[PDB]
Symmetry: D2
Subunit: 500 residues, 4 copies
C-alpha cells in the first residue's frame, strides 16, 4: 500500500487532449478517495464542457487527416500489441493502483490486469483479419464490394467498478479499427485510466487519436453523447444513465452501444454438486462486494435442497473476511462510495418493509479496523419473491436473495422474470438438463457449472434491458466499423426512360 | 382499363387489421379513406386502429414467440416458408404492381420493378435462413466448451413509409420471419393497400397465430406503442429524420434496439470526363424517378465547373420534356406526388429557395395543364445558383427537384458531397475509374455507385452513415439485426475456487 | 420393371445431345432382387469421355453458365430441386429397382436429394470473396472466388442419385461445367436426373453424362489435362489410383472412400436404444453404406447381454423385395459383391472369429434367385483381425469388448479409416469427451446415420480428402484469386541507370 | 520496396548447429553421413551438416505422431499457441541481422533481399499468431428436431513440410506458422543445399519451448528421405514447395496412404504491358519481375507480353537497362543481382539457351556466364533477354528459373489474355496500363492465383497465395492457409433419442 501510494507521486493529475496533458479549462479539480479509509489520496483536474468539445473536435480532425484511420491494419495491430505489452510490464503497479482506487482485493486486481493484457492482444491480432466482402452482384457487368471502414469519432464512458478492464474493452477495438476516441472514466475512479493514457502516449499515436476527459458525467457527459461529430457512443454503467445517453444520442442519430447491469440468476438444481454450488454462490454474490455487472445476486435453488442450501450459505457468509484489499487474508473489500453504501443500506429497509428476511448481515460491520472504511457486511435475504423490489432491482452490493423452485420450468420462468438479461448460471450434473435450461434463458452469457468467466474471444452483453450491442469478440470489433457498398457498373448504358 | 382492373381488386381486398390470426376492425370502429393521388378520389376505406389494438398485437407477438412454434421451427423449414411467400409475390406480380401504382401514383413500370425486387428479397432471405447458427470458440480456459448461438431477437415492430410500401415491407418481413421472430407491422396510414394484400398471401402460406400482425393507423395514435412498449425487442423504422429521432428517444425507455433508415441528401457527382449523355440521363433518373420521392434520390448534383453550363442547359432542356400523367398510362414518365400535405411542403421549399437567393431555372410549381389539374402533380424542377449554406441544398425536399452546384477539383467535390448531415447513397460519374475509386473511398455514404445511379439489391447491405440511419437492411448484416448472440460456456471439469473461508 | 423403364433414355448425354457409345457397345443392367436383365444402356468409350471433357471446357470458357449471375444459377438449382420433388415417387421406385434397397429407404433418399439441391440453391449467391486490409500503403486487395472450371464426377452404386446430388448441386451453383459417370452397374436414376436437368435448361456442354466401365473411361476422367477437379466416391483402391493419375496434370482431388465405422456402447447407454441403433447401423441397405456401423465396441460389463440381445433381433430381420412393404433388408448389389462378402466369412473363421449368426446366402425359395446374404454377427474378434480392420460393405457386424473409456477410444481409432461413428451413453459429458478424441469426420451422440446438406461430411485419415455438403462442400468447386491494385505506382529503381 | 529492405563466414557459423533435430534432441545422421554446404558467390565450402537417413525421417514422423497423441500441444489453448507463435516472430526480429546474413551466405541473394525476407517472415509468424484463436468452428441450425449440430476445427495431425532453396526461411515460415498455430506436430526438411537459416530457426523455436516431438528437422536429400516424408502412413498432410516434377512424384506417393497434399510449383508468369502503360514504370517492373534473385522466384515475370505499338521501343529500353545490371557479392551494397544457386542449376539455365537458339529465338543480350575476374569463380549467369519467340517454343512455355525473360508482342486485349493463359501454369502475373477499367477486365480473365495491377511481386500473410492449373494444389497464407492445417468434425447430439423400430422385435 505505501508502494502504491508512492506510485501516485509520479502519476499525472491532468486530462489528455489533442496530444497534450492539460488542466481543466476553469482549473477546477476533484479529490479522489481510498474507500478502505475514506482518505483523500489524489487530486485531479475536473474538466468542462469546453474541454469535452475540444477533444471531440480534435478527434474529428485527426480522423479526417487519416494518420491513424488510413494507417495499415497490420501496423495498427502492432501498436495495439505494444499497449498490451505495456500493461504486462506494469501489471503489478496497475493492479496496486486499481486496488487503491476501487477497494477490491489485490488478487482480484491482478486477475483484471491479466484479462486486460489478453483483451489488447486479442484485438491486436484481429485488426487485420477482415476488411469486408466481395458480393456476386445480381446485375450483369457490375462489381459489388462491401468495405469495412472505422466508424469515425467514438466517445467512451466507463464505470467505477472495473475501471481499466471496461476501458480496455472499448479502447482496444477502437484503436484496432482506426477510430479516434474520447474517453471519460468515472469521476470517482480515474487512476488506472490516467496511467493507461500515459502508457499509450509512450507507445505513440497521432495527435488527436486518443483523448482523456476527466469529470462529472452530469457536466461533460451530455457533450460526449450529444455532439454532432460523434459517430458512436459506448457506455457501461447503470440503466438510468444509459437511457439518458441514448435519448441524447438520438439528437444526431448517433449509434449507441450500452452495457447496463443485470439481475443475474444463479440456478441451483437438486442434482448439482452441492459443495461446488455453495462455493460458486458465494463467488457470484460477493466478489468485489457484489459490485459486478454480472453478480449472481438472484439465487434460485430447487425446493428439495433449499433449507440445506440456505443453512450452508449462511454459515459460510458469517466467515467471510472483510478488510484492506492490500492485506493477503482479505476476501471482501469495501464498497465504492458513501452514496453507494447508502443506496445499499436503504435497500435493506425496503426489503424488510416488503416482508423479506435479512437472514445474515445487512448492516455495516462493527469491528474497529473496519470503522473508517466503506464496508458493508455480506448479506443473504430469504423469504422473498419475484414481486419484491429487493428481488427485481439491481442492488449492486454484497447482497444475495434466495428463492425456491419446484421444476425446471419454474426455474426458467423465475430467472427470466426481470427487466434484465446480462448473464447467469445453471448448476446441475445433468448436462442435458443444464443445456435445455441455457437455451431458454434470455441472457447474453450462460455458464453451465461455473460463475463469472468472460473473455476476449467471446461477445458479452445484454438481452432485454441489460444493453444494446456486444463488446469483445468479432461482434465487439464490428461496433467500431461501418459498411460501405461500392458498386461499379462496367458497362454503363443510358436508360432513356425520360423523353429526349 | 388496367386502372379499372386494379379498382376491381379492391372489391375482394381486406379492410381490416390482422391480429393474432384474425382479421379485425379497429376497437373503436373508426375508419380511414384511402385516396389515389392521380385524381384524389377516395378508392378504399380501411380500419383506423387504436393504441390498444397495437398493444394487443404486440402481446400476441410476445405470446407466439414464447410458445416457440415459429422460433423453434428448423431454420430450413423457415426458409421454405419464406420462399413460399416469394412465390406468392411472383404469382400475383401484376395485381400487386397495379395496387402499388393505384396507391402511390408511381408508374406501372416502376411498380413492376418493385415486384421483381420484392420477390428476390424474399428469395435471398429464404436461402440465408439456415446458413449460420453461430460459432464455436476455442476457449482460453482449459476444460471448457464455448459456443456462440444466434437466436431470434424476439418481438419486432416494423414501421414503413408511403413511397415504396411493399418493397420496404419486404426488407423487414423477410429477415424477421427467416430468423424466427414474431412481428407487428404498420404501413404508412396513407398507403396500406399492398401491405394488406401481402398479409393475405402470408396467411395463405400458413404461420402460427401471432407470428405476423398487421396494424393500420396514424403514427400519432399507435406509433408510441410500437416504439415504446416494454415487450418489443427491436423497432425498425424507415421514414423521415424527425420521426426517427422521436422513435429512438421513445425506444430508450425500455432499452429497445433500433434500426433506422432516414433518407438523405444524396450527391450525384459529375466530372468533366464523364460520359456526358450518360450523366445527363442518370441525373434525370436520379432526380425524378417516383417524382423524387426516393430515400436515395440524387437531389444534389455536383458538376465540374468546366462543363457546368453545358450540363445545366442539357438538363433543363430534357426536364421541360418530361411527361407527367397517370401511372397506368404507358406514356407517363413521372407521376404525381403522394398527398396534399407533401405537395404543400415541396411548394413551401420553392419559396425558401427563392428567398435565400437561388434561381428556379425550370419548374417549381404545380402544373396548370388541363390534363393534370385534378391530380397531385408538381413540375420537375431544377434549382441553380445555389450553394451549400442554403436550406434548399441541405434539407431533404423529397420531391421532383434537383439542385446544381459547381466544383473545381476532385477534393472540392468530396468536401461538398460530405457537407450535409446525411450519408445514405451517392454516385460518381467519370471515365477515369481510378479517380472514381478515390472519390468513392472518401465519401461518407452507405452505398456509392460508380457510373450508375439507384441500384440496391438483397445481396448487399443498405443504410446510412451519419444521420441517414442506424444499422443496415439487406445482406447478411440485414439478417443480423434480427438475431441476438448467446455465449454458452460449459465448464467440463468444475472445481471449487475456495476464495472464501470454510 | 418394364413398366417403370419404358420411357427412360438409354444413351449418354454429351454436349447437349443424347448419344450412343462411339463404338455402339451396350451394357445390360440387372435387378439384384431376381438377377434379371431389366434395361440396356450405352457403354461409352474413352473418346466419348474426352469429347465430353472438351465440351465442358468449351462451355466453361464461353461464359454462358460460369458468368451467369450467382442469383440466377441458384434459381436453376432450385428448379432441379423442385423436379426431384415433383418426380419423387418414380425416382424412388427407379432407385429401388436399380440398387435393391427398400422403397422406404429410397423415399428418404429423394427427400434428402431435394434438400441438398435446395441448400446449394440458397448458398449460390451468398459469398463471392473478401476484401483485405492491405499491409502495403496505396493498394487495394481483394480475393475473388471463381468456379474452378471443368469437374469430373464419379459416383458409386449404393446411393447413386444421393451421391450424384452431392456433386452436381455445388458444381452448378458455383458456375462449373461437369462430366459425371455413375457406377456402370446402377445408371437408372442418374440418367433420369439428366433428363430433368435438360428440361430445366442449361447451356450446351455445361452438363454431361458418360456411361461406362471405369476400367475404360475412368483414366480419362481423372487424367485429362483439361479437368480442374476430380471428385470420386467409392472404394479406397480405386480412389488411390485416381489420385495417382490426377497427379499427372496436378489436378485437385476430392475423395470419399469407405470407413470402418465404430458404434461405441457404454454400460450406461439406453440399452434397447443401443440395440435398435446397432441393428440400424449394421443392416440398413444390407450394410452397403460408407458410414455403416460395422464395428461395434461394447463395454465388457454388458458385452454378453448385448450380444444375446442383438443376435436375437438379427434372427428376426425380414429379407425380401424392396417393393414389398414388409421387407426390412434388401439384397446386395452384385454377384461379385456377394462373392467378396462370402470370402470374408472364410477369412473370419480362419483367423479365429466366430460366426454367431448368419454368414451365408439364404436358400428360402423367394430369396433363392436374388443376391441375398443373411444379416451376420461376428463375435470373439479382435483388432488384429482382417474381418475387423477391412471394409466388408455387407450385412455384417463385428463385436469387440472394451474395459474403459480410454480403451474404447483406442480401439475405435485403431483402423486406417476415419469417416463416422457413434457413442451411446446417458452421460452426455462422457460422450462429448469421447467425441472429441475420435478421429472421425462425423460423430453421433446417441444416434446413428444422420447426414444433411447444412453440415460437411468426409473423412479423417484414409476415408478421404476434402468435404462434401455445407459451405466446405461448395468451396471444393471454387478457386481464389487475389487481385492487388497499386493506386500510386512508383518506380522501384533497384537496377542502375 | 517489396523485395529489398534496408538495415533500418566463420563468425556467423561458429555457433550454428550442424545436426538434425528429432524428438527434442540435436542428433547426427543415424549413419554419420555429412554434406558440405557452399556459398554460391565463390563456390567455397562454408559448412558441413548431417545428412540424415530414411530411418531418421521415420523416427521423426513417429515422434511427431506420439507428440500429437499426447495432446501437450494439440490440446493447448489456441490463445497460448498464438502467444508461442508470436514469441517465434519476436526471435526472428531480435536476430534479423544474423539471419539475413546467413540467408545471403547460403542463397547468394543480396543482403537487402534477405532483410526483406526477414521482415516478411516476422509478419508471417505475427499474422498466424493473431489468427490462432479466431475461429474454432460453427454452430449449425440443424434440420432435425431435438438435435445439436456443431462443426469443430481440429489440427490436421502430423504434417511433413519440404521447402525449396530460393527463399529457405520465408518458405519455412509459411508452413511452420500455421502448423504451430493450429496445434499440429511437424517434420520439416529444407533443401539439402540451403539448410542454414532453417537450422537457426529450429534453435530459436527450441528456445521458445515446445513439447518434445512437436517440431522436428530432418536434413538431407529428397532422393534419400523424401519418399518417407510423402509416403509414411502416419502423415496427415504433406506440404511441398518446389518444382512440378518433384511435386507430381510427391502427390503420387502421398496417394498410397490417402494423404492430403498442399503443393506450390512455380509458374510461367506473364507481365502484360499495354501501350498506355506508364512506360518508364513498365520498364522498371519488367526488370524487377525478371531479375530479382537472378530470376529464381516462383512468381518471376519471365514472360513479357508487350503491345505491338510500343514493342520495339520497349525491347531497346529493356536491353539497354539489362546491360547495366550490377552483378556481385550479395554482401556488397552496390550489387544488384547475385549468383544462381548451384552448379546443377546454372547448367539447367545454360542448357535452355541452346534450346532457345535451336528453336529459332534470339538471345538479344546476355545468355552466358560472365567473364569478369571477380565473377569467374561464382555461379553467375548474365541477365538475359530473349526476343523473336512465340508460344509454341519450349523457352516460352517452360519454367527456366534463372535471370531470363522472353518478349512476345500482341495486338489486342483479347490476344494478350489468350497468350498469358496459354501455359500449363497459373501462379501470378501483372497488368500494366493507365486504363484501370481495362486492367480490371484483364485481371478477371487471367487464370492466375494472384494478379497485380500496375505492380509486380507483392505477396503478404493477409492474402492467400497459390496456383490455378499446374502451379499447385491449395493455398498458403491468409485464412485459407490456416485451413490446410485444420480438419472439420461434425458432432451431432440427439437430445431426445427414440427407437426407430425399423427391424421387427
Ligand atoms: N516454387 C518455387 O519457388 C521453386 C523453388 C525451387 C525450384 N523450383 C523449380 O524446380 C526446378 C528444379 O528444381 P530443383 O531440382 O533444384 O528442386 P526441386 O523441385 O526438387 O525442389 C527440391 C526439393 O525436392 C526434394 N526431393 C527430391 N526427391 C524427392 C522425393 N522423392 N520426395 C520428396 N522430395 C524430394 C529435394 O530434397 C528438395 O528438398 C527448377 O528448375 C525450378 O523451376 C521452383
Amino acid at each position: 500500500q505505501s508502494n502504491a501510494m508512492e506510485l501516485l507521486k509520479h502519476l499525472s493529475q491532468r486530462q489528455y487532449i489533442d496530444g497534450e496533458w492539460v488542466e481543466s479549462a476553469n482549473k477546477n479539480t476533484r479529490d479522489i478517495i481510498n474507500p478502505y479509509n475514506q482518505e483523500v489520496i489524489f487530486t485531479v483536474s475536473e474538466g468542462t464542457k469546453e474541454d469535452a468539445e475540444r477533444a471531440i473536435l480534435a478527434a474529428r480532425r485527426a480522423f479526417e487527416s487519416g494518420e491513424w484511420s488510413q494507417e495499415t491494419a497490420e501496423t495498427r495491430g502492432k501498436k495495439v500489441r505494444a499497449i498490451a505489452d505495456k500493461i504486462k510490464e506494469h501489471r503489478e503497479a496497475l493492479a496496486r493502483l486499481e486496488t487503491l482506487d476501487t477497494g477490491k482485493t489485490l488478487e482480484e486486481s491482478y486477475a483484471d490486469m491479466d484479462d486486460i493484457h489478453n483483451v489488447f492482444m486479442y484485438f491486436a491480432g484481429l485488426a487485420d483479419k477482415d476488411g469486408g466482402e466481395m458480393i456476386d452482384s445480381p446485375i450483369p457487368d457490375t462489381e459489388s464490394k462491401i468495405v469495412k471502414e472505422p466508424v469515425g469519432v467514438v466517445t467512451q464512458i466507463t464505470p467505477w467498478n472495473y475501471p481499466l478492464l471496461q476501458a480496455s474493452w472499448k479502447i482496444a477495438p477502437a484503436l484496432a479499427t482506426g477510430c479516434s476516441l474520447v474517453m471519460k472514466p468515472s469521476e470517482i475512479t480515474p487512476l488506472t485510466t490516467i496511467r493507461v493514457f500515459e502508457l499509450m502516449e509512450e507507445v505513440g499515436f497521432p495527435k488527436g487519436t486518443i483523448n482523456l476527459i476527466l469529470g462529472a458525467g452530469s457536466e461533460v457527459g451530455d457533450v460526449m453523447s450529444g455532439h454532432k461529430e460523434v459517430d458512436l457512443v459506448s457506455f457501461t454503467g447503470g440503466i438510468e444513465t444509459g437511457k439518458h445517453i441514448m435519448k441524447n444520442a438520438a439528437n444526431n442519430v448517433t449509434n449507441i452501444a450500452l452495457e447496463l447491469g443485470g439481475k443475474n440468476p444463479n440456478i441451483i438444481f437438486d442434482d448439482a454438486d452441492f459443495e461446488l454450488a455453495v462455493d460458486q454462490a458465494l463467488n457470484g454474490g460477493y466478489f468485489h462486494a457484489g459490485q459486478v455487472c454480472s453478480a449472481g445476486s438472484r439465487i434460485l435453488v430447487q425446493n428439495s435442497i433449499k433449507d440445506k442450501f440456505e443453512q450452508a450459505l449462511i454459515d459460510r457468509v458469517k466467515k467471510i473476511k472483510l478488510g484492506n484489499g492490500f492485506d493477503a487474508d482479505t476476501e471482501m473489500g469495501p464498497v465504492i462510495s458513501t452514496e453507494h453504501r447508502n443506496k445499499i443500506e436503504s435497500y435493506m429497509d425496503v426489503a424488510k418493509a416488503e416482508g423479506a428476511t435479512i437472514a445474515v448481515g445487512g448492516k455495516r460491520p462493527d469491528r474497529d479496523d473496519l470503522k473508517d472504511g466503506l464496508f458493508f457486511e455480506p448479506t443473504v435475504i430469504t423469504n422473498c419473491d419475484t414481486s419484491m423490489r429487493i428481488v427485481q432491482e439491481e442492488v449492486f452490493g454484497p447482497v444475495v436473495t434466495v428463492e425456491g423452485f419446484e421444476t425446471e420450468q419454474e426455474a426458467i420462468q423465475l430467472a427470466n422474470d426481470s427487466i434484465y438479461g446480462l448473464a447467469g448460471a445453471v448448476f446441475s450434473k445433468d448436462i442435458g438438463k443444464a443445456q435445455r435450461v441455457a437455451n431458454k434463458l434470455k441472457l447474453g452469457t450462460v455458464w453451465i457449472n461455473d460463475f463469472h468467466p468472460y473473455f476476449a474471444q467471446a461477445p458479452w452483453g445484454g438481452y432485454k434491458q441489460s444493453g444494446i450491442g456486444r463488446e469483445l469478440g468479432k461482434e465487439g470489433l464490428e461496433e467500431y466499423l461501418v459498411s460501405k457498398h461500392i458498386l461499379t457498373n462496367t458497362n454503363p448504358q443510358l436508360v432513356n426512360w425520360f423523353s429526349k
